[PDB]
Design an enzyme around this catalytic site. Structure first.
Site, PDB file in Angstrom:
ATOM      1  N   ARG A  25      10.323  -0.953   1.102  1.00  0.00           N
ATOM      2  CA  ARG A  25       9.257  -0.789   0.231  1.00  0.00           C
ATOM      3  C   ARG A  25       9.524  -1.084  -1.432  1.00  0.00           C
ATOM      4  O   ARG A  25       8.875  -2.177  -1.822  1.00  0.00           O
ATOM      5  CB  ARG A  25       8.803   0.821   0.467  1.00  0.00           C
ATOM      6  CG  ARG A  25       7.539   1.278  -0.686  1.00  0.00           C
ATOM      7  CD  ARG A  25       7.211   2.600  -0.533  1.00  0.00           C
ATOM      8  NE  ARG A  25       6.657   2.728   0.724  1.00  0.00           N
ATOM      9  CZ  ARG A  25       6.420   3.719   1.570  1.00  0.00           C
ATOM     10  NH1 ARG A  25       6.894   4.814   0.916  1.00  0.00           N
ATOM     11  NH2 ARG A  25       6.236   3.576   2.734  1.00  0.00           N
ATOM     12  N   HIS A  71       0.741  -5.105   7.083  1.00  0.00           N
ATOM     13  CA  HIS A  71       1.065  -3.991   6.246  1.00  0.00           C
ATOM     14  C   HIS A  71       0.401  -2.792   6.532  1.00  0.00           C
ATOM     15  O   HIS A  71      -0.687  -2.450   5.956  1.00  0.00           O
ATOM     16  CB  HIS A  71       1.076  -4.635   4.808  1.00  0.00           C
ATOM     17  CG  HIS A  71       1.997  -3.676   3.717  1.00  0.00           C
ATOM     18  ND1 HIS A  71       3.220  -3.750   3.524  1.00  0.00           N
ATOM     19  CD2 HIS A  71       1.219  -2.987   2.603  1.00  0.00           C
ATOM     20  CE1 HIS A  71       3.458  -2.924   2.676  1.00  0.00           C
ATOM     21  NE2 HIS A  71       2.371  -2.542   2.086  1.00  0.00           N
ATOM     22  N   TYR A 115     -15.167  -7.769  -5.603  1.00  0.00           N
ATOM     23  CA  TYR A 115     -15.561  -8.649  -6.840  1.00  0.00           C
ATOM     24  C   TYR A 115     -14.701  -9.861  -6.793  1.00  0.00           C
ATOM     25  O   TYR A 115     -15.172 -10.993  -7.550  1.00  0.00           O
ATOM     26  CB  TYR A 115     -15.913  -7.875  -7.982  1.00  0.00           C
ATOM     27  CG  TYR A 115     -17.097  -6.821  -8.004  1.00  0.00           C
ATOM     28  CD1 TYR A 115     -18.332  -7.283  -7.658  1.00  0.00           C
ATOM     29  CD2 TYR A 115     -16.682  -5.390  -8.175  1.00  0.00           C
ATOM     30  CE1 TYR A 115     -19.399  -6.188  -7.681  1.00  0.00           C
ATOM     31  CE2 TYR A 115     -17.913  -4.553  -7.800  1.00  0.00           C
ATOM     32  CZ  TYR A 115     -19.138  -4.952  -7.777  1.00  0.00           C
ATOM     33  OH  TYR A 115     -20.058  -4.116  -7.656  1.00  0.00           O
TER      34      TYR A 115
END
Ligand SMILES: NC[C@H](Oc1noc2ccc(-c3ccccc3Cl)cc12)c1ccccc1
Ligand SMILES: [Cl-]
Ligand SMILES: [Mn+2]
Ligand SMILES: [Mn+2]
Lengths: 483, 189, 481, 189
Positions: A25, A71, A115
């Site tokens: 991680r 993931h 967006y």
DNA sequence: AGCCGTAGGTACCTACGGCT
DNA sequence: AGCCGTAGGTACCTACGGCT
């Protein structure tokens, strides 16, 4: 088996978590400079053909693809990681090319993932170059449905170039970014001399080079960090004192320390003024614009000493800030404090392995191809007999056997012949085969030369690094003052 | 949640009301921070032609615009207190940006009519097509929509005020049948 | 420039209103879908998310849809997709969900990250033959993709799953129906264009809610099917039963459509607390996956349980109405339609779909026959074929010579040049010949269908009947006289 | 956020603490609502070995568990007021579910030690193949994890309390060096 | 009233280590 | 202090029509 001792449970559960955060991680791999999430993002962009020549893709598609295939964590983890890779104030060498509001220095977040759009930058192609030529080991994804890269080829030294920061369990990492021309010069110098010292490497690599420019005070923090992997480095804004008329002055800040939020730094100054903890400031304005760059103005009271005010600001505000170097990375699937030379040595070892494996794969692929061409030439030299054998055969299996016995072909050669399309019997094709064969024999020899001589291989690594330096290396932005 | 400009001179100042927090961010980077203020709205805002006065004045969005403009509302409205001489409505160039624009105009018309009459109310013109404000870059939002040198604003003119009342009541009022009849008559499906 | 405020309001409002009517809130009479649903299912198709294949992560499905077809918030998309998976919302669920997809208590679904989805078996029937020129494609929002204007919709999904949508200046509210009844209705209409609403109602008795329950009386149903508007009284299935010691309880095992169970219980609890209802000593939800919906209301000893129940119907969603307002897109324009109109437009659609499928299949068969006639020529004259190719310097020259020497088309020549050597074995030779022979028979069958309107209509009937037999099920809602 | 059961008989009642709002909804459908209560947790919860009592008692998650258990905390603990005689920890079988489990046991150890000593504290065992709780069906969660007929719960036993103190302090306390030394020593494992 | 279902939505708890 | 960056996060504004 239905009872669990609380001490055992705590020890086992904790150590599962701690180990996972360290290896899977929070810490980058010393070989490609990446954390699992970043590696999955880039590999995803690769596997989706999201290259610089191709047009942008919707972020949500990119992220959804990544979270599904590689993931298994929340999308916000993925999207935020991808966003930072696109920001020129976070990444010295941006890995992602963003379309849309991708955030600002004010800690304005990006536009929502619906967006925004993204692809690889050009330099990212250098991280992925040769990934499909058995250069790096693939592993099973989390669910067993996919393959993912365990490390990227990383044709430039990305750990030191873009730097890393991670809070793990039991330790953290904090590696500042550097200038690519400097890094590559240092790898070149090291490659020519395994016994180069830190002081000599620093003739190439003078110090960190922040995306956000600024000043570093003195070489002493740099030196300690590169010798031991730990060190404090004082970063200072670029400030000048200038006249504003009627004989009054102002301080103008145009570069601020790495990772300092501009808006918040201003707030701190405003608060110092309001709470009367600094004397002589009459006005404070952010005049930053996309046109003129960062411009913060601090008006000084007439006849006050502006240099004294500025010294105070460095002492009492993030206008001067330290970067605490703590170079912990991945060395063989473990967190390890490493100095500058060690980081470069693991990087150059990775490059040698990548280029060796690339050469070996190319050699295997060339020999397999030569082998197929040797059969195709036999087939074209005996084409009537070849066709008649095939027509007399009832089945594929029978034809394969007949072709193999009659013309000394291998299984693969026979397959290739049965796969040949009729248009390959036109008249130029015989000579095309011969053309390709002659170059391939030549190619094979060149590859074999490389595998035969450590020195030839090592020079090939140098040559490729130098090409990368010339294409992507740029000027230093951070000024190290001998202060 | 307003990003105000530096200048205190209402005569040269402009406030942009931008649809969406995401477009909000972009417009703050892109703008001239000296003369241009940004006020982002979450999305659909209250329809004041259909709400009670209590509800209107308690509404966060509405309150923020009133405070930002500084003119007061209704009876207490004073044009000379206006903090900006240009209020610019900037929505997505799509059907929902359209709707938001009608909602905003309804608000100005019913509660700040003189601002329209004084010619302080404008509509920005971002590039037309499929891309909304949230998807545009900061520099491009500047170039096309906010830069005084190249931008094309529409000034909002009030002409016949009887016609305006009937129009606002028909489209935004609570009588559904008059709205439905307008749609059918002018539909061009 | 200057813009008159009346003009801007008129233009801007009408832009919005028109969009919401034809491209957001109202279903199309042909496939029963609103834009968002159509894009979801089309997306599942385009990703090969079929029942035989294993589920895909919701976020992938949704991200794909939002990017290629639906330029709106993903919560819009995900929530629409969720409803299509809920068996208490969809009479015939269109999506097969993996994970927590919500409950009658108005528990939302699990986040998009956690859930997975594919088509149900019935959804295959909405999509079947979409890639055989059955329906018109159109350009997506950005010009980078193609999306269906309508789905083939091999069963009558508008009425089967129903619809509800708030638009501008109108809304729509169509209850779900039983699929066996619907298809029998379509069959009856196909045999008689002039069938009345009353006759249709011999097949279609009324709505059939996923959540069962009772409808009181035929008269609201009658009005709704005749005019498209009507009020329909729904009740829970409740019974009174002994719990011993001479005490009683009411047990509810079915609640009205679209009523939140948890909320209905809270309403009862509040009535009890605020003393607005007399005689209830206890209220428990004993609902479980194992025993199904079970709400128990204990009655005070000697109190009249029937009176209590009648009160609960008066004062709680335990009795609820469904106001029918059947507004759908017909030809792109919104329209209040009665039951017969809904079915007429659906049957028209089916005829068009099956006709275009037949024509596409015919063109594709003839193209393929034409290619096989070239391969057969090539096999019949293989030595000459090889000679011509070997004499040619280039592909272009080979193509030209094959066309001139064997009277082949360009397409045929290309196909011969493309043929691999393994195609000359015996088994391969036989395959080419056998494929040709099957294709000639296939072509003949197709031509028969396009030659006779009656045969084509019968084909529609036959296919509908097949769907009826495979997917038709029992009525759940009881219509009481 | 608590979904309580029917029975008020604490002797046959169980409360499940489930990781995640998503998994929480699933377990409410699947459960037996007569004897099984469900309390969802957002995610990582406070580490009480590191936080001070003001922060602990102001924490929403902690408050909810304390209220739900009904036993009060620390000195004021009363085992007899337990509302459930089974508190079951139900997390994902992954490294983050592990961590949540350590955070929970730390909380019980430091504030409700007797609940452990009484053998009221258990650990659920959902299917260990890679999937988290948020991706399971309600019937699946029931069959494997919540149904008394098939489920395998682990009872958490406290044995050596000196060894437990040292363990809680080393793994969850403020001193990083002791934590780092543990990881290094046991990393082979 | 306030719900229903597609739209334009949103702000913010927690672990973890280092700063020295 | 509180912030750096990946992790396990989440509530609740509005429009619109027709029913209660
Ligand atoms: N290099 C000395 C020491 O190593 C470790 N410290 O904590 C660890 C925790 C775990 C492992 C490990 C072992 C095996 C497998 C997986 C793991 Cl992650 C090694 C270390 C160190 C000191 C200071 C900084 C970094 C490292
Ligand atoms: Cl009775
Ligand atoms: Mn928009
Ligand atoms: Mn998990």
């Amino acid at each position: 088996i239905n009872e669990r001792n609380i001490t055992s449970e705590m020890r086992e559960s904790f150590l599962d978590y701690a180990m996972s955060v360290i290896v899977a991680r929070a810490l980058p791999d010393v070989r490609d400079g990446l954390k699992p999430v970043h590696r999955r993002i880039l590999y995803g962009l690769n596997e989706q053909g999201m290259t610089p020549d191709k047009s942008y893709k919707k972020s949500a598609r990119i992220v959804g693809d990544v979270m599904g295939k590689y993931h298994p964590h929340g999308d916000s983890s993925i999207y935020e990681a991808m966003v930072r890779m696109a920001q020129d104030f976070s990444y010295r060498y941006p890995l992602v090319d963003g379309q849309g509001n991708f955030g600002s220095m004010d800690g304005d977040g990006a536009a929502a993932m619906r967006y925004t759009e993204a692809r690889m930058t050009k330099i990212t192609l250098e991280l992925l170059r040769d990934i499909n030529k058995d250069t790096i080991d693939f592993i099973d994804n989390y669910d067993g449905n996919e393959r993912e890269p365990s490390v990227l080829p990383a044709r430039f030294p990305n750990l030191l170039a873009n730097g890393a920061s991670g809070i793990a369990v039991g330790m953290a990492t904090n590696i500042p970014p550097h200038n690519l021309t400097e890094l590559i010069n240092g790898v070149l110098s090291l490659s020519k001399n395994p016994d180069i010292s830190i002081a000599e490497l620093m003739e190439d690599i003078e110090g960190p080079d922040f995306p956000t420019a600024g000043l570093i005070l003195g070489k002493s923090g740099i030196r300690r960090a590169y010798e031991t992997g730990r060190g404090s480095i004082q970063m200072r804004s670029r400030a000048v004192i200038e006249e504003r008329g009627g004989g009054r002055q102002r301080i103008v800040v145009t570069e601020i320390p790495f990772q300092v939020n501009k808006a918040r730094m201003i707030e701190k100054i405003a608060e110092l003024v309001r709470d009367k903890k600094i004397d002589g400031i009459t006005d404070l304005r952010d005049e930053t614009s996309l046109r003129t760059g960062v411009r913060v103005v601090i008006d000084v009271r007439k006849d006050a000493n502006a240099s004294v005010i500025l010294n105070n600001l460095y002492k009492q505000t993030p206008l001067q800030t330290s970067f605490g170097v703590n170079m912990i990375a991945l060395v063989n699937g473990r967190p390890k404090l490493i100095n500058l030379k060690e980081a470069l040595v693991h990087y150059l070892e990775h490059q040698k392995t990548v280029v060796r494996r690339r050469t070996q794969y190319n050699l295997r692929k060339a020999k397999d191809r030569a082998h197929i061409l040797e059969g195709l030439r036999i087939a074209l030299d005996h084409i009537d007999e070849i066709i008649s054998t095939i027509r007399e055969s009832d089945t594929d299996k029978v034809a394969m056997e007949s072709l193999q016995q009659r013309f000394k072909l291998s299984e693969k050669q026979a397959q290739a012949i049965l796969d040949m399309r009729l248009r390959r019997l036109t008249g130029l094709e015989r000579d095309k085969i011969e053309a390709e064969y002659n170059e391939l024999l030549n190619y094979i020899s060149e590859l074999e030369t490389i595998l035969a001589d450590e020195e030839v291989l090592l020079q090939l690594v140098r040559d490729e690094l130098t090409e990368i330096r010339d294409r992507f290396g740029d000027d230093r932005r951070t000024e190290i003052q001998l202060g | 949640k307003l990003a105000d400009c530096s200048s205190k001179s209402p005569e040269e100042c402009e406030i942009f009301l931008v649809e969406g927090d995401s477009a909000g961010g972009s417009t703050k980077s892109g703008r001239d921070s000296r003369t241009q203020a940004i006020l982002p709205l979450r999305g659909k805002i209250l329809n004041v032609e259909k709400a009670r006065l209590d509800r209107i004045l308690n509404n966060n969005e509405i309150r923020q615009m009133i405070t930002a403009f500084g003119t007061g509302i209704g009876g207490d409205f004073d044009l000379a207190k206006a903090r900006y001489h240009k209020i610019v409505i900037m929505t997505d160039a799509d059907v929902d940006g359209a709707h938001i624009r009608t909602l905003l105009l309804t608000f100005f018309y019913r509660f700040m009519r003189p601002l329209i009459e004084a010619g302080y109310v404008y509509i920005a013109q971002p590039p037309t097509g499929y891309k909304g404000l949230g998807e545009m870059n900061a520099d491009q939002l500047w170039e096309t929509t906010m830069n005084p040198e190249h931008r094309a604003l529409l000034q909002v003119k009030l002409e016949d005020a009887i016609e305006a009342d009937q129009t606002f009541e028909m489209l935004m009022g609570d009588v559904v049948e008059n709205r439905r009849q307008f749609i059918e008559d002018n539909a061009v499906y």
